[PDB]
C-alpha cells in the first residue's frame, strides 16, 4: 500500500520520464497557480516521493526558483525549500556557486522592499540553505564548495536593512548562530584537510555582528573563539592570518572584563577618541562615570539586566536576607550603597563576596559557567 510508489520506480529504471517523476513535477506546476486545492495535503506526498532521488531532486531546484515563480504564492516554495533542500548533492560541481548566490540575491531584493515587513520570507530560506551546507560538508570532495558559499552567505546576511537596532525581527541572529556553529562543528572535528582561509569570518562581516544587542549571538561568537582556539595554535601565528583573531580576542577581553576600554587603542577600530567625545555629553554627573557606563549593554556581566536577575535569584535561594535595593549594578552604586550604607547593619547576610565589585562579578561568573543551564560564556580572562 505504501511501496508501489517505489517498485514502480525500480521496475524499468531511473533517470527517465517514468510515472512518479512526471507526476510530482506536474503537481508542483499545478500548486503555485491558485486554481487547485490548497497544497497542505499534496506537498507531504511530494516531500515523501522526493527525499533522496537525486536524479529528480536535481531538477526541482533548476526550475522552481529565481523569481520566475516566486511572486505567485511564496507561501509554499518556502515549504518546498524546507523539504528538498536539506537533502541534495551536486554533480555539476562548477555550476552551483554561480547559482545559489543569484538565487538568494533575487530572494533579498524582493524580501525586504515590498510589504516593508520581513514576515518570514528571507531568513528561513537562508536557514534551509544553511542546513543544506551541513549535508554538503559532512561528505568529502565538495567542502571546497561549501566553505566558499558560506562566506558570501554571511556577507549577504549582514546588510543592514535586516540586522540592526531600528527593526530587528531576530531572523538575522539565530540564522547567523546556525551559520557559525556549523563552522565550529567543522572546526572541532578531526582530519584537517583545509587551509585556514576557509574558517575565519574576517573583520568586515563579524566585527559588525559582535557589537549587537542580543546576548545569545554574543554567546555564539564567544563559542567560536572558545572552540577555534583549538587547531589554530598549530599554525605559526607570526603574522599570517591569526592577527585578526588576536585583534578580536584583545578587544573582547578589553570589552567584557578588562576595563581599560576608554584610553586603550582602536578597540573595534573606531579610534576611541570617539568615546571621549560621546561620553562627555550625557547625564547623571556623579564622579565614577567613565568606567561605570561603557561596560555592557543588555545582558552580560556588569551593566545589564541578566546580572541582577541571576544575582537576586542567587541570594534568595541561598540565604534569605536583606534583598537588593536597586536595579543594575555598577562600579559606584554597589559601593556607595552596600559599603557605606550597610556597613555594620546587614554585614554578614551575603554570599561571602567579602570584597567590592572585583569579586562580585566572579561570584556570578562562576555561576554562569558551572551550572550548565543559561549559556556557556567564559572568554573573560582567556
Amino acid at each position: 500500500k505504501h511501496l508501489y510508489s517505489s517498485i514502480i520506480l525500480i521496475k524499468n529504471s531511473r533517470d527517465e520520464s517514468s510515472s512518479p517523476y512526471e507526476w510530482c513535477i506536474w503537481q508542483l506546476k499545478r500548486c503555485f497557480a491558485h486554481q487547485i486545492e490548497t497544497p497542505q495535503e499534496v506537498i507531504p506526498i511530494i516531500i515523501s516521493v522526493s527525499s533522496m532521488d537525486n536524479k529528480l531532486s536535481s531538477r526541482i531546484i533548476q526550475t522552481f526558483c529565481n523569481l520566475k515563480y516566486l511572486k505567485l504564492d511564496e507561501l509554499t516554495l518556502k515549504k518546498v525549500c524546507g523539504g528538498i533542500l536539506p537533502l541534495w548533492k551536486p554533480e555539476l560541481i562548477s555550476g552551483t556557486r554561480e547559482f545559489f548566490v543569484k538565487f538568494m540575491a533575487s530572494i533579498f531584493m524582493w524580501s525586504t522592499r515590498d510589504g516593508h515587513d520581513n514576515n518570514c520570507t528571507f531568513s528561513e530560506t537562508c536557514f534551509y540553505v544553511l542546513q543544506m551546507i551541513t549535508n554538503w560538508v559532512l561528505d568529502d570532495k565538495l567542502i571546497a564548495l561549501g566553505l566558499t558559499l558560506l562566506h558570501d552567505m554571511q556577507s549577504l546576511l549582514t546588510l543592514d536593512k535586516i540586522f540592526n537596532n531600528a527593526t530587528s525581527n531576530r531572523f538575522s541572529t539565530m540564522a547567523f548562530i546556525s551559520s557559525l556553529d556549523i563552522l565550529t562543528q567543522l572546526s572541532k572535528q578531526t582530519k584537517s584537510d583545509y587551509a585556514i582561509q576557509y574558517l575565519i569570518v574576517g573583520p568586515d562581516i563579524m566585527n559588525k555582528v559582535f557589537s549587537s544587542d542580543d546576548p545569545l549571538l554574543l554567546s555564539a561568537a564567544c563559542r567560536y573563539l572558545v572552540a577555534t582556539k583549538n587547531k589554530l595554535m598549530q599554525y605559526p601565528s607570526t603574522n599570517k592570518f591569526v592577527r585578526m583573531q588576536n585583534q578580536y580576542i584583545m578587544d573582547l577581553t578589553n570589552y567584557l572584563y578588562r576595563n581599560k576600554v576608554l584610553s586603550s587603542k582602536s578597540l573595534f577600530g573606531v579610534s576611541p577618541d570617539f568615546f571621549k567625545q560621546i561620553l562627555e555629553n550625557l547625564y547623571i554627573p556623579t564622579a565614577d562615570f567613565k568606567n561605570a557606563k561603557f561596560f555592557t549593554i543588555t545582558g552580560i556581566p556588569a551593566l545589564s539586566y541578566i546580572c541582577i536577575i541571576i544575582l537576586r535569584r542567587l541570594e534568595t535561594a541561598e540565604n534569605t536576607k536583606i534583598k537588593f535595593t536597586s536595579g543594575i549594578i555598577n562600579e559606584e552604586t554597589f559601593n556607595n550603597f552596600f559599603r557605606v550604607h550597610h556597613d555594620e547593619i546587614g554585614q554578614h547576610g551575603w554570599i561571602k563576596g567579602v570584597n567590592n565589585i572585583h569579586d562580585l562579578r566572579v561570584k556570578i561568573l562562576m555561576h554562569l559557567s558551572n551550572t550548565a543551564n543559561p549559556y556557556r560564556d567564559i572568554a573573560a580572562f582567556l
Binding site: 546556525s178 559588525k208 544587542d213 542580543d214 546576548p215 550625557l282 539586566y305 536595579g327 543594575i328
Partner: protein
Amino acid sequence: KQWERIQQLEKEHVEVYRELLITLDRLYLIRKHNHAVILSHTQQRLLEIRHQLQINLEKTALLIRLLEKPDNTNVLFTKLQNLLEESNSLDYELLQSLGAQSSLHKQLIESRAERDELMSKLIELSSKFPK
C-alpha cells in the same frame, strides 16, 4: 488605548533618527571635498559600525539614570520593568531547539545513506533477473 500612539509615533521617531544620523554624516564628506561621494563595501562597514556603536552607547543612558532609583513612574518605570523583564525565552526553549533540529536532521540523512545505496544495489538484482 493610549499606548499604540506611543508605539507608532515611536517607530516613526526611530526611523527619522536613523536616517538623519546617516545623511548628516554624508553631508560632511560632501562639504569637505568638491563632489567626491562614492564609497564601496570595504569602508561602508567602518562607517556603519560606528553608527551601531553610538546608538548602542545612547542605549545605556537609561540603565544608569532611570533604573537606579526604584520609582513608580507610570509611563516610564512599570512598562520598562514589565517589558525589559521579557526576552526570557533566550535559554532552553529557544537555544536547544536549534540543537534538536540538527539532532533530527542527522538521523534523517542517516536514513537516506542506507536507502540510496540500497536502491543502487537493488537495480543490479533486477536487470540480472532473466526473462
